[PDB]
Structures are given as structure tokens and as C-alpha cells.
């Protein structure tokens, strides 16, 4: 259960763009500065930049 500090604009066809305050079900946070988050609103998957999200 993380929160996108800011709306992230997907940079490639592997990450999902989120908004500020949007909840993101983190998945794998060991690949590096990019973790796989799953949006529950639509139900899609997409990596995400950790600098735009925060552990609440």
C-alpha cells in the first residue's frame, strides 16, 4: 500500500503512470529504484519510480 507522491508519467511501455494521492499495490521493490506496482482502480500492472511514491 504505497502512495504516488506525484502523478508519474510512464516513460516506457513497462511502467504505469499514476497520479498524486493514487494508491499503488507495490509488488517487487528489489529490482532497484523501480518497483512493480499494481493499480487497483483499473487493475493494470506497471513499474513505478520510487522517487514519485512513498511508503505510508
Amino acid at each position: 500500500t504505497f502512495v504516488a507522491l506525484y502523478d508519474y508519467e510512464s516513460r516506457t511501455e513497462t511502467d504505469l503512470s499514476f497520479k498524486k494521492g493514487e494508491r499503488l499495490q507495490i509488488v517487487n521493490n528489489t529490482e532497484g529504484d523501480w518497483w512493480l506496482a499494481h493499480s487497483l482502480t483499473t487493475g493494470q500492472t506497471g513499474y513505478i519510480p520510487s522517487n514519485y511514491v512513498a511508503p505510508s
Partner: peptide, 6 residues
């Protein structure tokens, strides 16, 4: 390279 934070 993460993006530029707001």
C-alpha cells in the same frame, strides 16, 4: 534514471 521530482 528516475524523473525530476516536482
Amino acid at each position: 534514471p528516475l524523473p525530476p521530482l516536482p
